[PDB]
Symmetry: D3
Subunit: 237 residues, 6 copies
C-alpha cells in the first residue's frame, strides 16, 4: 500500500485511465471493462482493474487539481508498476470554434501552477505528453470516426479565476481547453519516469457559460473513453 | 446547484467543517451530528447537514490540495450562504518539539502555490484565519483540557516534494505543520468576504518517527472535531 | 554592543516597544515608564529602559521601512535577549468602514518587499504576529473601552507607490492599514525565534483628505501605548 | 521589404527551412534545391528560394538566439505569407545515450528565456511544435531509415551558462538537446498565427566535451535536411 | 510641507547631501557650510541649508534602507525643487583589493529590493547615477589627492542576510561596496526626473574584522564630504 | 579556434568594436582601418583586424540579441585576450527630446532578458559599462564637436514586442535608446572580468517619425565610429 492507495503491486494494470471523478472511474469500469474488480477506495478515490478486449486495464479517479492528481500518479508510478497514465477529463473552452462535447488531446499543457518551476529551477518546463501516446489517440479517434483536436491545454489552479483577462491570453495562444491537471501529470511523468497523455471532453464554454450537468460529466463522455482504450491497443502493437 | 455540489440554498448550515477525505465527512456526521442528512454526493465528495447541541452544522469533504478545496469553499460561500469554513485535517510536523497528536491551529498559512500571488498582484498576501474563529478554537480546546499550538501552517502543492531542503526552511521559520489546503482556503475567504480557520492534528513527523496507538490517534482526531464544533458555539455567543 | 546599538546584554528588557519616529521613544519613557534610564543613542535612535507597574520595559525607535526595523529587531533579539517586540505606529486606511484614529492590530502583514521571499526560497511566507500577543492587545484594548480591529496590515516598501491600483486590491482583500514595517518585523521574529506584534492607529485615509486635531492625535497615541503596555502585563498572565 | 529582409511577397515559399547559420542555408540551397535564387542578404542573413522535387521551398538563416530568430520568423510570417517554419539546427546533448550526429525532433521546447512569460502573463506557456509537422518529420525519417528521437529541447539564452547544475536538471527531465531557438520560434508561431517545428543534429556533448568543427556544422548535417524536406512533401498530401 | 518634511519651497537648495545617520547632518552643516539655517526637524531628521564657497547646499539625513531614503528623496524632488541628491555614507567591501577607508563611487547599484521591479514591469532597471555627477566626484577626489574607485554598489534590504553565499556572487561580479540605499535613490531620481550619486567610504570588510581608529574615520568622512561638495562646484562648471 | 570563431590567439587586437551587422564590420574595417585582414568568417560573422592611427584594432559583428552577442564577447575575452568591447550600433528613441542622429552612450543598460538574473541569484544586477571607457567616449565626442548623451539603454529580447505599454515605462524612467545587446555584453564583461561600452546612434523614434537624409544618417554613423576609435586612443593614454 501507499499513503493514498490501499493496494499491492499487481493490483493495477500497467496502463491506468484516470478521470478526476471517482464516480466516472466506476462508470468506466462498469461500462467498458470486463471482470472489473475494485482495487482502492481510500478517501473514496475509487480504482478498478479489468480487461478491455482481453487487455488488462485499470481506471481510477485522481481528484481535482494538480496537487491531488500528482499524489495519485506518483504513487501509481513508484509503487504499482504503472507505465502509462491516460487522463480522461473535462475542460472549458475559450476558442469560439470549440464546442461542448468536442474531444481535445493535450500534446502540451500550459499552467499557472508553480509545480514545474519548483522542479525546473524556476525556468520554463514545456509540460508535454508522450508523442507515441498522442499519435495512438489520434489514430484511434480516426478509426472510430471521432473528431479530435491536438494542441495545448491550460492546467489552472483556480477554476474560479480572479483574472478573467487571462482567458483572452489563452485564446490568443490557441489553448484548446482549460482543465486542472495535465501540466502536473506531465511533470510527474517526467520526474518519476513514466509516460502520460491527457484527453478531455469540452464540458463548459467559458465565454458562453453553457455547461453540462454533473450527471452528464459523470456518465456521458463516452467518445473520449473509447479513444483512450483503443489507443492503448494501438500502443501495444 | 453548482457543477461540483448538487444542492440548493438552505441545504448547508452557515458553518461547514471540512476534512479532506469525504469518508471522514461521513464519519464526522455520524459520530457528532444528530438528524444528519446527506446533501451532496457529486464526485463522491460527501456532504452532510445535521445538528450539534441544537445548532445546525454541515460537514463536507474538500479533497486534497489548494485547487480542490478552492472550488468547494468558493461555491459554499457564493452559492450556499456559508459564512464560516473550518478545515479539520492532518498535518506533518517539522519541529522537534511538535509531537504526534498535537493540535495545531493555523492562524496563518505559508504556501508554495501561486494562487495568492495571482490574486494579489504578485506581492505577498499573508494568508490568515479569522481572528475570532482562532480565539474560539483556542478557548474550546482549553475548556476540553487541550493546549493547542497556534501559528503558521505550510500549505504544499507537492506532497512528494522534489525539494527536500524546504523542510529545513520550514523548521527554521517555525512552521507548526505541513498540509495542503489552508493558504488556499484563507485566500478564498478573503477574496469572497467570508471567514475561515484550519485546525490539524499531527499525523507524522516528516523526518523522524515516534510511536502512538490507533486508539490514541483516533481520540485526538475526535478532540479536534470537538474543538471545531464547540468553537462554533462560542462564536454564536 | 552591536553595529547599531551601543549597549550590553541586560540593558534592554525582554519586551521592547518600538515607534517609527525616534522622538516618540523619549516621550513614551517620560510619559509611561518609571525610573527610565538611557540605554542607546547611536544614530540618534534613543533607547530607554524603565518599568510599567513594576514590569521591565524598553522603548526605542525602529526607523522607517522594513530594512531599518529589520536591523534593530534582529540585534535586539540576538544580542540583547529580547523576546517580544511591539511596534506602535501609524497606518493609512483603504477600507471605507475603517475610520481615522481606529486602532488596528496586525495579526498578519502582507508586503511588496522581497525580504521574506529571500528567506523562504521564493515561496509565500505568511508574516504573522504571535497569537497570544494579538489576543493580549485585543483584551487590553477592551478593558480600556476601545474596540480594536484585528486582521492584515500591508507593509509597503514605497510610501509613494507608482501602482495606485494596488490600493484597490488591498481593499478587496480586507487590508486594515498600510504601513512600512510589520511584515519585516514578523519575518525577523520567525527567523530568530522571537515574538512580535504591530499595533497601528489610522492616521489618514489613502484616498481622502480628512483631518485630525493635535489633541486627538496625542490622545489616540497615548491610547495605543496604554494598550501595548497593558497587553504585556496580560501576557505575563 | 521588412526591417531585416529585403524581399517582397512571393519571394519566399510558404515553407522556410531555417538553420541558424546563413552559410548552412547557402549549402542547403546549393545541395538540395534546384534553380535556387538568393532572395535576401541584409545583415548577411542569406535566404534562398528554389524547388525540391518540384515543390517550392525556401531556406534562410535565422542567427543565434531567441531574439535573433524571433525577428526573422515574425517578418516571414507577417509580410511574406510563410505558413510553416522548420528550424534545422544544432544542439548539445546532456543524456548519456544521446550521441553526436543523432537527430532530435522537438515536440516541445523548455527555455530559460523570459519571452514566453512576457507573452503569457508570467505563467508557463508550453512551447510546442505543430503536431502534424512533428508526425510528418517522424514518418519522413522512418522512410529514410534515419533514427530520430521526439521530445523536449531546451532553448538556452546562454551558450556559456554560469549554471552548470542546470544541466543535471535538464538531464533529469529528459531534455534531448540544448539549443537556442525553438521555444522562441514556437512562441512566435503561436503569437503570429503560423506553424513551426525544430529538428536538430547533436553537434556537441555537454558532458564529454566532444564537439564537431565549424565546417562540419555548416556542410555535413545532411540527414536532418532530408528529413525536413521530405516531411514537407508528406504534409502537402 | 510634505508628510516627512516641515518646510516650504525655497528652504532647500537644489543640491542636497544626505548621510544615513541623521546626526551627521548637523556635523556637515557646522563643519563645512557657512550661514547654515535649520529647515527641518520632523522625526528628528534635521535638515540645514547654507553655502559652500558661495554655492547654496542643503544637508539632511535619509535614514537606513531603501524605503526610508525613497521617502525623503521623492519629497525633496517633487515638492522642494531639488535637482541633485548626493548620498554620502559607509559600505562594506567584498573584494580583497578594496581596502578599509577607500572611497567608492556608485556609477550603478545592484539590489535585492523589489522596488525597481515594481516600477519597471518586473524587468531589470539598471539603477544608475548621473554620469556628470560621477565624473565630477572622480575629478574632485583627484584634485584632493584621492583615487576613488567607480563601479557597482549593492544596495541590500537585509543588513543581516540569511544568504551568505550572495557575498561571493557580489565579489565575482565586481561589486565595490555593500550599502542599503543607492539603488533606491537612483530609482527615485529616474522616476521623478532628477539626478543622484552615492559616494561611500569602506567601513569594513564583510568577511574579516579589521579595525580603524576614530581619528581615521573622521578624516575619511571629512574627505568624502569635501569630495561631494567640490564635485558640486565642478558640476556648476 | 572556438565553435563560433575560426581564429587563433593574436589574430584579434585587445580592443574589438562590434556592430550587429557583419557587413557593417566590413564597412568599418574598409573605411577606418589600414592594413586590415579578415580574421573570422564562421557563420558569416565577419571579423577584421587592422590599425587606426598606428593602433591595432579589431572589428567584428555580434549578431542581433543578447544570446548572440553573449557568445562572441565571451569567446573574445576568454580565448582571444580581448580586454575591451565597444558595441557600435543603432537604437530607437522613446523620449521626445532625443532626436534622430543623437549619439547615445549606455553607461547602464536595462533589460527584459533573464540572463543577468541567472547570473545574480535572481536579484537586480545593474548592467554597467566601464567608467573609464565611458569617459574616453565622452571626451572623444567633445573633441569632435559632438555632444553625446550618457544614460540608460534598454536591451530588448523582442524587437516586435507584444507589450506596447513598456515603451511608456521606458520613457517615464528616462531610457535614452532601445537596442538588443548592451545589458548582455555588460553582463559578460562582469562575469569574465573585462570592460565594455555600448555607443548607439538613434535610427528611429519608436512612436513618431522625423525626417533626415541618408547622407546625414551615414555621417552620424561615421561619427559614432570615430568616437569609438578615438576613445581607445585616449584610454591608451
Ligand atoms: C472543466 C472546466 N473547467 C475546468 N474543467 N477546469 C478549469 C476551468 N476553468 C474554467 N473552466 C474550467
Ligand atoms: C499529513 C499531511 N502531510 C503530511 N502528513 N506530511 C507531509 C505533507 N506534505 C503535504 N501534506 C503533508
Ligand atoms: C500612515 C502611513 N502610511 C500612510 N499613513 N499612508 C500611506 C502609507 N504607505 C506606507 N505607509 C503609509
Ligand atoms: C549547439 C550546442 N549548444 C547549442 N547549440 N546551444 C546551446 C548550448 N549549450 C550548450 N551547448 C549548446
Ligand atoms: C557598512 C555597511 N554595510 C556594511 N558596512 N556591511 C554590510 C552591509 N550590508 C548592508 N550595508 C552594509
Ligand atoms: C534600432 C533598434 N531598435 C529600434 N531601432 N527600434 C526598436 C527596437 N527594439 C529593439 N531594438 C530596436
Amino acid at each position: 500500500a501507499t499513503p493514498h492507495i490501499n493496494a499491492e503491486m499487481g493490483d493495477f494494470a500497467d496502463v491506468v485511465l484516470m478521470p478526476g471523478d471517482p464516480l466516472r472511474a466506476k462508470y468506466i469500469a462498469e461500462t467498458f471493462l470486463e471482470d472489473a474488480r475494485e482495487v482502492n477506495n481510500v478517501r473514496g478515490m475509487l480504482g478498478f482493474t479489468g480487461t478491455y478486449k482481453g487487455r488488462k486495464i485499470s481506471v481510477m479517479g485522481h481528484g481535482m487539481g494538480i496537487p491531488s492528481c500528482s499524489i495519485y500518479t506518483k504513487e501509481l508510478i513508484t509503487d504499482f508498476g504503472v507505465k502509462k497514465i491516460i487522463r480522461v477529463g473535462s475542460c472549458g473552452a475559450v476558442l469560439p470554434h470549440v464546442k461542448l462535447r468536442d474531444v481535445v488531446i493535450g500534446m502540451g499543457a500550459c499552467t499557472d501552477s508553480k509545480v514545474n518551476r519548483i522542479r525546473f529551477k524556476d525556468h520554463d518546463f514545456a509540460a508535454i505528453a508522450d508523442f507515441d501516446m498522442v499519435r495512438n489517440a489520434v489514430d484511434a479517434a480516426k478509426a472510430l470516426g471521432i473528431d479530435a483536436r491536438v494542441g495545448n491545454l491550460f492546467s489552472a489552479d483556480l477554476f474560479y479565476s480572479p483574472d478573467g483577462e487571462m482567458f483572452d491570453v489563452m485564446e490568443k495562444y490557441g489553448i484548446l481547453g482549460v482543465e486542472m491537471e495535465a501540466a502536473g501529470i506531465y511533470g510527474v511523468a517526467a520526474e518519476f519516469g513514466a509516460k502520460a497523455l491527457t484527453i478531455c471532453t469540452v464540458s463548459d464554454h467559458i465565454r458562453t457559460h453553457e455547461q453540462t450537468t454533473a450527471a452528464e460529466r459523470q456518465t456521458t463522455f463516452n467518445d473520449m473513453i473509447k479513444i483512450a482504450l483503443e489507443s492503448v491497443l494501438l500502443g501495444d502493437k
